[PDB]
Amino acid sequence: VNSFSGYLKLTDNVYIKNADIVEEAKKVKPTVVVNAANVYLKHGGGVAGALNKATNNAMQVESDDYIATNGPLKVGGSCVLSGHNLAKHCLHVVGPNVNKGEDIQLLKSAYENFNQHEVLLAPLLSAGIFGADPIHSLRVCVDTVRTNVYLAVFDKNLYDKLVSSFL
Numbered sequence: 747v748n749s750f751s752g753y754l755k756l757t758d759n760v761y762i763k764n765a766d767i768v769e770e771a772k773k774v775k776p777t778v779v780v781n782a783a784n785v786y787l788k789h790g791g792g793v794a795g796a797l798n799k800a801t802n803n804a805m806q807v808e809s810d811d812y813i814a815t816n817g818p819l820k821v822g823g824s825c826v827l828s829g830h831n832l833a834k835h836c837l838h839v840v841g842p843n844v845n846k847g848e849d850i851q852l853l854k855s856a857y858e859n860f861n862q863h864e865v866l867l868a869p870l871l872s873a874g875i876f877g878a879d880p881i882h883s884l885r886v887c888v889d890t891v892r893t894n895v896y897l898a899v900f901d902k903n904l905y906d907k908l909v910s911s912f913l
């Protein structure tokens with residue numbers, strides 16, 4: 747049993763809810779929250795900007811030190827950093843950004859990072875301002891992630907469409 751409430755079950759291991767991932771993290775304090783990161787860990791907008799704002803910029807301060815030491819992530823890659831006030835850990839995962847012309851086949855590689863964690867709270871990757879089709883992102887998630895993932899989708903309108911189109 748876990749703390750996640752109000753989710754629709756899509757598969758054995760994937761659950762979905764219309765929720766603000768920031769407000770969901772604040773309530774649950776999950777072991778892992780996933781950030782929709784870029785390779786520079788520059789948390790300006792989208793899910794990353796919202797998570798970082800909720801940490802009072804501490805996420806960005808920590809991220810800048812990580813990049814100064816290690817250099818940029820790979821598209822499809824990830825790193826584990828603090829979850830600050832939101833979670834124990836934040837898994838920063840880089841999905842391909844269609845608005846930068848990145849290979850959408852890298853979305854499966856991105857979701858494979860989730861398999862290193864038994865339970866996660868996560869946004870659909872590459873969706874929103876990353877320009878991928880969220881329906882596609884949910885299909886790759888279900889077909890890739892084998893650990894237990896709780897998806898918090900921001901838009902009530904994109905949410906209802908994801909449920910009603912899910913195969």
Ligand SMILES: O=C(O)c1cc2c(Cl)cccc2[nH]1
Pocket residue numbers: 782791792793794869870871872873874875876898899900901
């Ligand atoms: O609600 C979602 O699933 C979602 C929103 C979003 C943004 Cl704005 C940027 C990157 C990934 C994202 N996922």
